[PDB]
Enzyme design. Sequence first.
Site, PDB file in Angstrom:
ATOM      1  N   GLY A 149       0.893  -1.140  -0.118  1.00 44.96           N
ATOM      2  CA  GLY A 149       0.090  -0.195  -0.010  1.00 44.96           C
ATOM      3  C   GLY A 149       0.872   1.210   0.199  1.00 44.96           C
ATOM      4  O   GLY A 149       0.200   2.272   0.192  1.00 44.96           O
TER       5      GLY A 149
ATOM      6  N   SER B 202       1.360   8.839   3.294  1.00 44.60           N
ATOM      7  CA  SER B 202       0.264   7.755   3.685  1.00 44.60           C
ATOM      8  C   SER B 202       0.769   7.260   5.065  1.00 44.60           C
ATOM      9  O   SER B 202       1.993   6.966   5.346  1.00 44.60           O
ATOM     10  CB  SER B 202       0.345   6.843   2.596  1.00 44.60           C
ATOM     11  OG  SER B 202       1.348   6.047   2.448  1.00 44.60           O
ATOM     12  N   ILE B 203      -0.190   6.503   5.496  1.00 47.07           N
ATOM     13  CA  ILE B 203      -0.124   5.655   6.989  1.00 47.07           C
ATOM     14  C   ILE B 203       1.064   4.677   6.466  1.00 47.07           C
ATOM     15  O   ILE B 203       1.943   4.506   7.452  1.00 47.07           O
ATOM     16  CB  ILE B 203      -1.057   5.036   7.355  1.00 47.07           C
ATOM     17  CG1 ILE B 203      -2.316   6.124   7.984  1.00 47.07           C
ATOM     18  CG2 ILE B 203      -0.856   3.914   8.509  1.00 47.07           C
ATOM     19  CD1 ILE B 203      -3.584   5.610   8.133  1.00 47.07           C
TER      20      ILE B 203
ATOM     21  N   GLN C 202       1.304  -1.118  -7.397  1.00 46.69           N
ATOM     22  CA  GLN C 202       0.370  -1.212  -8.716  1.00 46.69           C
ATOM     23  C   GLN C 202       0.615  -0.367  -9.817  1.00 46.69           C
ATOM     24  O   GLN C 202       0.029   0.811  -9.481  1.00 46.69           O
ATOM     25  CB  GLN C 202      -0.965  -1.398  -8.171  1.00 46.69           C
ATOM     26  CG  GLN C 202      -2.288  -1.488  -9.162  1.00 46.69           C
ATOM     27  CD  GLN C 202      -3.451  -1.827  -8.651  1.00 46.69           C
ATOM     28  OE1 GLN C 202      -3.799  -1.440  -7.534  1.00 46.69           O
ATOM     29  NE2 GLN C 202      -4.194  -2.862  -9.403  1.00 46.69           N
TER      30      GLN C 202
ATOM     31  N   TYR D 204     -18.806   8.123   4.503  1.00 46.46           N
ATOM     32  CA  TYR D 204     -17.907   6.939   4.461  1.00 46.46           C
ATOM     33  C   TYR D 204     -18.730   5.633   4.194  1.00 46.46           C
ATOM     34  O   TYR D 204     -18.014   4.954   3.452  1.00 46.46           O
ATOM     35  CB  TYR D 204     -17.533   6.776   6.022  1.00 46.46           C
ATOM     36  CG  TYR D 204     -16.269   5.664   6.313  1.00 46.46           C
ATOM     37  CD1 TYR D 204     -15.114   6.243   5.461  1.00 46.46           C
ATOM     38  CD2 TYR D 204     -16.124   4.686   7.045  1.00 46.46           C
ATOM     39  CE1 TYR D 204     -13.716   5.551   5.758  1.00 46.46           C
ATOM     40  CE2 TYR D 204     -14.954   3.983   7.027  1.00 46.46           C
ATOM     41  CZ  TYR D 204     -14.022   4.235   6.213  1.00 46.46           C
ATOM     42  OH  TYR D 204     -12.828   3.709   6.451  1.00 46.46           O
TER      43      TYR D 204
ATOM     44  N   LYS E 245     -15.235  -1.795   6.481  1.00 48.56           N
ATOM     45  CA  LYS E 245     -14.391  -1.997   7.545  1.00 48.56           C
ATOM     46  C   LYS E 245     -15.039  -2.794   8.781  1.00 48.56           C
ATOM     47  O   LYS E 245     -14.210  -3.194   9.282  1.00 48.56           O
ATOM     48  CB  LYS E 245     -13.761  -0.450   8.120  1.00 48.56           C
ATOM     49  CG  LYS E 245     -13.037   0.201   6.956  1.00 48.56           C
ATOM     50  CD  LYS E 245     -11.674  -0.352   6.474  1.00 48.56           C
ATOM     51  CE  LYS E 245     -10.617   0.532   6.101  1.00 48.56           C
ATOM     52  NZ  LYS E 245      -9.521  -0.057   5.763  1.00 48.56           N
TER      53      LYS E 245
ATOM     54  N   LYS F 166      -4.304  15.114   8.653  1.00 43.99           N
ATOM     55  CA  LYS F 166      -4.284  15.989   7.774  1.00 43.99           C
ATOM     56  C   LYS F 166      -3.191  15.860   6.547  1.00 43.99           C
ATOM     57  O   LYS F 166      -2.082  15.616   6.759  1.00 43.99           O
ATOM     58  CB  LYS F 166      -3.817  17.365   8.573  1.00 43.99           C
TER      59      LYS F 166
END
Lengths: 249, 249, 250, 248
Positions: free
Chosen positions: A12, A18-19, A39, A154, A161, A191
């Site tokens: 990812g 990103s996280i 990807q 969401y 989720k 943010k």
Amino acid sequence: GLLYGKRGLILGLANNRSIAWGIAKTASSAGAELAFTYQGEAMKKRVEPLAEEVKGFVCGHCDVSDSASIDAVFNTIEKKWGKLDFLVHAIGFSDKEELSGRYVDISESNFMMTMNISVYSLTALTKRAEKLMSDGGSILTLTYYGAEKVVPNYNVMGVAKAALEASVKYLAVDLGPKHIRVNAISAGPIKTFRYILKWNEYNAPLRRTVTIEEVGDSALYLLSDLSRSVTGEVHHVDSGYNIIGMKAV
Amino acid sequence: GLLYGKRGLILGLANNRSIAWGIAKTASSAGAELAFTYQGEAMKKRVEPLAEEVKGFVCGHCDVSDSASIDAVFNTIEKKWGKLDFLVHAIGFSDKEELSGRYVDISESNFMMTMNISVYSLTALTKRAEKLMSDGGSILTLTYYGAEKVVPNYNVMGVAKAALEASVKYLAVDLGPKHIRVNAISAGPIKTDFRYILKWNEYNAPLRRTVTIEEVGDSALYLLSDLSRSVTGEVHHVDSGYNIIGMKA
Amino acid sequence: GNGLLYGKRGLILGLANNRSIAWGIAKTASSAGAELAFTYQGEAMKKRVEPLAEEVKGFVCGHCDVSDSASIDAVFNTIEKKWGKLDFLVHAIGFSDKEELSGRYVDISESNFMMTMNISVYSLTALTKRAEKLMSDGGSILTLTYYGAEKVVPNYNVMGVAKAALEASVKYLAVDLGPKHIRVNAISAGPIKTFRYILKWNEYNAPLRRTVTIEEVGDSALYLLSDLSRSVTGEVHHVDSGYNIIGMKA
Amino acid sequence: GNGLLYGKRGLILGLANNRSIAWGIAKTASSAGAELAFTYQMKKRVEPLAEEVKGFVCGHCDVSDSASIDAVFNTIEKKWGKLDFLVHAIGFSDKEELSGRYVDISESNFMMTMNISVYSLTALTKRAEKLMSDGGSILTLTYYGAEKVVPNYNVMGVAKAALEASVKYLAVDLGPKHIRVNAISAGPIKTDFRYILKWNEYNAPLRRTVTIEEVGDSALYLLSDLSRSVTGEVHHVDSGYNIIGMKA
């Protein structure tokens, strides 16, 4: 040195905001050698320097909807390392346009794609990862409070989720006897939607939104031996937002 | 070095077999200087050598039902240190005899004492600690799955822990603006009727073993350190995943 | 009888036989005054459903494959023609591969996962989208779930993951339709004697020391479908002899 | 009417006025066929309400006073010999300390709140058990503040968390005698508090706050045989407010 000698796969990493990047930065600094998928060619060019920065390596193209694509990636890892200590699943998709709508107006096609990419992918990745984690390991995915309570815009992602969180628990029971732990971080918004951010900023107990470095450190814990008795857990890293039932007056 | 330069107070160290000891050992080794309370002379003699082993110190008798007793402890800490970085509440009591019974047969007196010692004490300690506590400090308490689901022979302690968990959340909101975090570890039972609860966890927990004080110690370390700086109001399960099962498994 | 559904008109999807929760709900709702419409999937089921519908003075409104959008439209068109308005809807539909239930959750196939999600979860959203137009006055939508959505239960596997998705969708739908006073709720039913392991386990460990019956689930459904529950939406209601509250063998 | 409580006999503790949840429950249960007994700690306000419902006033009850509780149940035993249900609509916490921070509460307020709002259910149930040999239903009241942090609720939230847990422990103890124990988690009712009402009004899925008659009907269900397989349940009657994770 919390991940000294450990080898892990992060799926990812798309960019440095990103996280997944927060996790990669913290895990690497803690001693981990990291493998990264991508990807498509555009992403490859973005990921290569990020991987180099962290002294990791790019192990190949992965489309989580493509079973053979997943097998190739794990074959490459098996050849290079023979064993895997952890896996980070920072993958999720849902149709941007349908997020703004009412949940009841979502299309079957968006629903199915969201379930496949955002939920089933963890199970698919884990099925292939199991053979490589005979010694034990840690599998981490990402979730959000929308799984538990209704959050505006969401919609189907919340439903997805919820499915993901439940799958984390079923997986944790399946793999527990092999000492593979499976957990999720429920991250607050970051943010990087302006409404959801500001709302968290004024109403979260800590009166701020969380950063990718903070989610990174919480990931480190769950990936390391510090958390060796923790599995099936949905861990809130959200400045405590999930505990409030109403704005203060 | 996760607690380098930090100073913390641990209430509830009674012997070298308890969670408090596991927490002390890990926190100390991570760099923390620790202060320890005790209740009664017999305990003092047991705690002194444990405190010396960790290069900590014994800060006095504390009866958490006695408001002045709590004031004296925090006065001693204020004189010695001037600030407090974290606080560990490993305190709880309920009548041993009435645990074996039916919950409905509990006495008013056992109920009231259980609520006061096991629940109110955290709030009393936190009220007093607030003035001493650094921005960014951490308060940790201990709970158990009996707060969420009915577990045999836990009775009023379950009711008390449910209250405790709720108080953690209210406290987290009160102290959040000072960035003081308040969390709980929900520990599995530890090999130390109770034999039944252990064995049951041993065979049915996802990880197929019960947890140790060293493991709870490391999870505590995470919550006490800056690795968990965005985590507050959390009930964190360190129980080999037992809490996620719905049936003999 | 009680008259709790006097004058009300409702659609029940999933009546396959006289041993199901759907039948318990039909029997109670009918006795409470409801006129009921029933769908079926396939000719074999039609033959089983016709007499059940007759027994309850209801009517068979047609073939419905919830995976087939046009099939769903045809059913609701028929209901619109006959009634013009709908007071409630019962979603007693769910599928997963029987063989893969016995396995480990991690061994499930993509195909089983996707079909389970579609038939067991998405179908409620699809049915609700069509039902919304017919419930301008307000109404009640009820689905069925199980504790395997909340905790890990042996041999429930992907159905547990699906039911967790369903329960979450009940809440999102409840927010969407709440302003039009359409309520959306689920019953989390305990297992019913009509898998033997799950029954016996409940029987010995549930607070009430017995498993529940379709008539009991029926009466709980009646409550949720009636005006008695007019301030209840987004709720997952346990009708399981209290099993869901235990943390360990008794 | 519906006859859902035909022939049933029940005790309601906490009827203080004609605006309360207890009154909503009394009205609905009575109309469903129940004969009702009422305590008081208020007598003058309760007497006409009891008459209206063809019920009767069974005496003074201070739930902090063990003998007081015994006298009430002795009176019910003499009059009826059996009890089908019990409604616990009792709760207290210091009004002044509700506006404050939770961390500032006094030991005294804490202890009194735990005793009157939590322990009282257990005390009442201990006495009620002997009268419910045939089975029965016990219902208490709670609020979302037990699950999530809500304004102005503080120690009452902590207390209601304790209550909800005690409902489940009691449900396990009494389940084999087929006595069911449940709670209704009621939304706020129009009867700083103006802000909480308005907030629910604009953000609850149903876009309105609930009334005592609605909570009454939900109580009826839990008290009747319609809910005979339901125990240990915390049932939300709050226009769905509990499910939202953010301003609408």
